[PDB]
Amino acid sequence: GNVKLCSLEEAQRIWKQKSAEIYPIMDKSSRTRLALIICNEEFDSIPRRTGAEVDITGMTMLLQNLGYSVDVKKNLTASDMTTELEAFAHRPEHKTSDSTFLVFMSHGIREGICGKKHSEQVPDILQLNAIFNMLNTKNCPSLKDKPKVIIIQACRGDSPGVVWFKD
Amino acid sequence: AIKKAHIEKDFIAFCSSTPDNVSWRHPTMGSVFIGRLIEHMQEYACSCDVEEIFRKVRFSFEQPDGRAQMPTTERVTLTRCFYLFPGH
Numbered sequence: 001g002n003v004k005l006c007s008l009e010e011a012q013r014i015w016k017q018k019s020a021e022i023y024p025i026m027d028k029s030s031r032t033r034l035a036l037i038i039c040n041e042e043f044d045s046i047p048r049r050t051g052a053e054v055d056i057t058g059m060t061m062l063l064q065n066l067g068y069s070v071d072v073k074k075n076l077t078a079s080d081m082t083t084e085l086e087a088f089a090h091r092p093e094h095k096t097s098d099s100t101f102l103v104f105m106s107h108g109i110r111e112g113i114c115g116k117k118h119s120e121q122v123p124d125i126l127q128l129n130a131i132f133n134m135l136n137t138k139n140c141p142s143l144k145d146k147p148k149v150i151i152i153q154a155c156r157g158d159s160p161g162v163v164w165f166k167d
Numbered sequence: 168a169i170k171k172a173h174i175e176k177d178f179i180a181f182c183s184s185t186p187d188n189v190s191w192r193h194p195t196m197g198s199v200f201i202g203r204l205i206e207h208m209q210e211y212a213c214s215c216d217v218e219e220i221f222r223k224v225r226f227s228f229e230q231p232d233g234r235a236q237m238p239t240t241e242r243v244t245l246t247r248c249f250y251l252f253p254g255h
């Protein structure tokens with residue numbers, strides 16, 4: 001809808017130029033695209049991510065507009081997530097899909113995403129390397145040779161990341 | 168017969184910021200990274216592969232301003248362009 005559509009002319013030209021160096025997309029009538037959105041708004045310790053609802057509404061709608069099936073999950077923990085991710089790599093719809101969109105939205109540390117039960121005393125994070133593990137050609141051979149885009153919205157530390165310099 | 172397949176491939180991560188650094192969120196408009204990616208997705212989904220659009224999102228963060236943050240694409244292992252061909 002809101003997503004600017006691609007005319008047949010352009011769709012043809014683009015494929016006309018890149019043809020062999022572009023991922024083949026399944027037929028619009030048969031493919032069953034799946035997208036997963038895990039976003040923690042409330043936390044046992046860390047301050048609630050006030051305003052997360054507007055992001056959930058944003059992505060879901062967008063991905064769904066890109067022709068994906070969005071299954072939204074909320075306030076999970078390291079485990080709950082690592083369990084929810086495995087059940088996804090298993091989904092049968094992937095077999096008849098051309099790609100998938102993963103979307104994580106939560107607080108975070110240098111190490112990774114923060115589950116809803118994370119704390120200084122008792123950590124609850126999900127390393128990024130793990131997410132890549134649950135969906136590789138070994139634990140999810142259905143997505144093999146298909147683009148898997150992973151989006152993450154979380155702090156990667158404390159520093160502001162800006163450095164002073166005079167002009 | 169059995170054949171070998173790369174264990175890791177066709178991946179592409181897009182983080183909201185760089186290591187050790189924070190990402191910004193507005194209590195009324197939510198995260199900024201998410202709103203920009205959407206804004207761009209809606210516009211360039213039809214002529215740019217997800218890789219070109221992510222770059223365009225980064226470039227949109229090129230000029231700092233109080234709530235600065237530089238998104239980064241990590242562990243990219245895409246072997247070809249990934250067009251979304253919206254409308255198809």
Ligand SMILES: *C(=O)[C@H](CC(=O)NS(C)(=O)=O)NC(=O)[C@@H]1CCCN1C(=O)[C@@H](NC(=O)c1ccc2ccccc2c1)C(C)C
Nearest residue numbers: 046047048049106107108154155189190191192193194234
């Ligand atoms: C990383 O952990 C978070 C990401 C998140 O959404 N979750 S959480 C539990 O941490 O809130 N990033 C932050 O929290 C960063 C780092 C510390 C403050 N912070 C913010 O995003 C604050 N943002 C603002 O104050 C703010 C952002 C954008 C913006 C745009 C236009 C006008 C005013 C503002 C204000 C929030 C409020 C804590």
